[PDB]
Design a protein around this nucleic acid. Structure first.
Ligand code: ZN
Lengths: 108, 166, 144
RNA sequence: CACCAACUUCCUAAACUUAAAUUGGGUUAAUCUAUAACUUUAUAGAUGCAACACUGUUAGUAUGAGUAACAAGAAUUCCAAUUCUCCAGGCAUACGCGUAUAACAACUCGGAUAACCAUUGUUAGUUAAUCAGAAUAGGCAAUAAUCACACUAUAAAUCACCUAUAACUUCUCUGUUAACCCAACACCGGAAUGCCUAAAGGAAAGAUCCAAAAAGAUAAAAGGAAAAGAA
RNA sequence: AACUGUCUCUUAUCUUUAAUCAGUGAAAUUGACCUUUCAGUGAAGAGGCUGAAAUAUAAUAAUAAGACGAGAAGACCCUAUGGAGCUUA
């Protein structure tokens, strides 16, 4: 549907420059102490979260190799151990995952 | 094609005398070819006009539009050269004096339709122009008070000059 | 009380079944925020079925249908259920993650089973009592 | 008992009388020549010499409009990685196409948007004695098939081998890839034959929301045109 | 005739559409427009004329019942001491 005459640039300029059509500023921006990067007040930091996922992938890779087959999910609890930490009696009766890396500072 | 925005960045002012105030730095940066509509980029440019360097970066980081990501890269590049070449001592001491987008050369193609129709396909490109002035953004406007408006009206009445009389 | 998801009611449960199976296997899953919230209730109720007891015949039918991989069925009754015996609820932790930068800008969240062996998530921390405002509130508390 | 109001009229300076086919006369932009001028001019001689309008022609850029419009199953331990949910015409040859094949490298253009490549660049490829394509002169032939027997029929349906002549030891050439072709297209349909029906081949979900209205499908308290029978 | 949500008499769910985010991106159209209501005038006739009336700016979202709506050489029939073409023995 076309108007019976061409729409003037002046008319068009007013429509696009109306405040309703302009981009709004956001004041909910926050700083992440953990990563030192920006975050939203309702959103978690991704720089630190990225570390968790990367460690999770590495941990998951170790578990997959240890299982050695599909549909081999243990019926017993699982635990992760890093270099410098040795399985204890409390770790008995739990699947033990060994990580070549030392215990991460953030991970406890 | 014209590239005078870069030439504006090549302007060299005469050496300032010792008894002359330190000239505020002006940085002209632009991205000539962007596969984006200028109008959409203009909306981003309009909002960021007059804002500080840090404030603009924070707003862009949480913006969902593709153009905003492009602007942030352009803004980051402008800040880097401003310190590197325009002698900007403080990274935070920068504000967006000017921000605007321009049309770029497009590509022409025909848009086929499944049932024998055709259309005019166009690949849009745009230019983005920003001028950065070292220093904090200027203070915002303050609306006139009732007293200010009233005084002007009285002054206007007094300022009236009689017409076509001796 | 239910999100309109899937090409049909079966698809939602099958999609939930796929989501539930993955979470049990890995114990921490990243998915769109809406899906994570929808499936959080099912996961909590599943843990209750594990608490009900391994011998419970009804639990097996629920576990068998919901968990496509049957190796997880022993895990639920012998890993998840023992783990959550002390807990009375809140077995699942769901947190909002920044939206995917995949040109669709979907709302993302991460849902995990509490007590897992995975590294702790970067949870938010409330302000410490040592802060000036908290210290002032502490003085008011002491006087009262 | 007036005033207002037309260039009618007067007044200062000037001027010397009021539709439109047609007809007489005086100038002029531009380009070139002759001869001059010399911040862009003159006198002559010339012409492809002046466009808001020929269903005029070419190019640029707007408006409609950032509108109509368009798109990928789930999780993970990862795009020649696993597993889960779900779908059910697949494989060969013919024809056609002619490198669209594959690896790598790119992420601009092409895919009717991306991712990813089918795009761009580079290099490779399709292997044949077996698969496929690329001597002569005479003499002399009644009876279909149908499990061909019986059995009938009408619609009427089968070189050889002899007699002579002539030659006298051979494996090259060419085709071989592919998701491919004809439909302006990575089209929705068109496309001969054999095998077989999942062991082969596949993904409806760009995200969010759960508006109304609209489209399709399912369900109906009581009723049954306000089951498939008759005229 | 029956049958059934066709309907009396509609309701509910699912799918499509819908709404929001991001990416890409046409078509018919277009004298210019700072684009109002009422009565008048006029050729059936006025957003733009006469006289009244109303009126911060800019935006945003919805519906097609009537004006026996507006219209074309659409549709239909008939005529000619109209033409012209055709056939001739
Ligand atoms: Zn952090």
């Amino acid at each position: 549907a076309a108007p019976k005459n061409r729409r003037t640039i002046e008319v068009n300029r007013c429509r696009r420059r109306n405040p309703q059509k302009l981009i709004k500023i956001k004041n909910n921006i926050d700083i992440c102490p953990e990563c030192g990067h920006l975050k939203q007040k309702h959103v978690l930091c991704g720089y630190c979260y990225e570390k968790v996922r990367q460690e999770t992938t590495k941990i998951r890779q170790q578990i997959g190799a240890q299982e050695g087959g599909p549909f081999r999910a243990p019926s017993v609890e699982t635990m992760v151990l890093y270099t410098g930490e040795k399985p204890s009696e409390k770790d008995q009766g739990k699947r033990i995952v060994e990580r070549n890396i030392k215990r991460p500072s953030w991970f406890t | 094609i014209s590239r005078k925005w870069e030439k504006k960045n090549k302007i060299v002012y005469p050496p300032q005398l010792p008894g002359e105030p330190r000239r505020p730095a002006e940085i002209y940066h632009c991205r000539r070819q962007i596969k984006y509509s200028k109008d959409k980029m203009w909306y981003l440019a309009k909002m960021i006009r007059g804002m500080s360097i840090d404030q603009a970066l924070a707003q862009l980081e949480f913006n969902d539009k593709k153009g905003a990501q492009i602007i942030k890269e352009v803004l980051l590049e402008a800040q880097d050269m401003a310190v590197r070449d325009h002698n900007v001592e403080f990274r935070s001491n920068l504000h967006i004096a000017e921000s605007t987008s321009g049309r770029g050369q497009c590509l022409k193609r025909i848009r086929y339709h499944g049932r024998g129709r055709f259309g005019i396909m166009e690949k849009v490109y745009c230019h983005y122009f920003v001028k950065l002035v070292e220093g904090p953004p200027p203070p915002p406007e303050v609306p006139k008070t009732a007293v200010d408006h009233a005084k002007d009206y009285i002054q206007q009445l007094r300022s009236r000059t009689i017409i076509h009389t001796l | 009380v239910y999100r309109r998801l899937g090409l049909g009611p079966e698809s939602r449960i099958h999609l939930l079944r796929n989501l539930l199976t993955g979470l049990v296997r890995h114990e921490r899953i990243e998915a769109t925020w809406a899906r994570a919230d929808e499936m959080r209730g099912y996961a909590e109720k599943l843990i209750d079925y594990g608490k009900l007891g391994d011998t419970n015949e009804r639990a097996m039918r629920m576990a068998d249908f919901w968990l496509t991989e049957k190796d997880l069925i022993p895990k639920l009754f012998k890993v998840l259920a023992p783990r959550f015996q002390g807990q009375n609820g809140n077995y699942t932790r769901m947190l909002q993650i920044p939206n995917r930068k995949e040109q669709d800008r979907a709302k993302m969240a991460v849902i995990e089973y509490k007590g897992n062996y995975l590294p702790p998530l970067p949870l938010p921390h409330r302000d410490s009592n040592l802060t000036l405002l908290n210290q002032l509130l502490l003085g008011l508390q002491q006087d009262l």
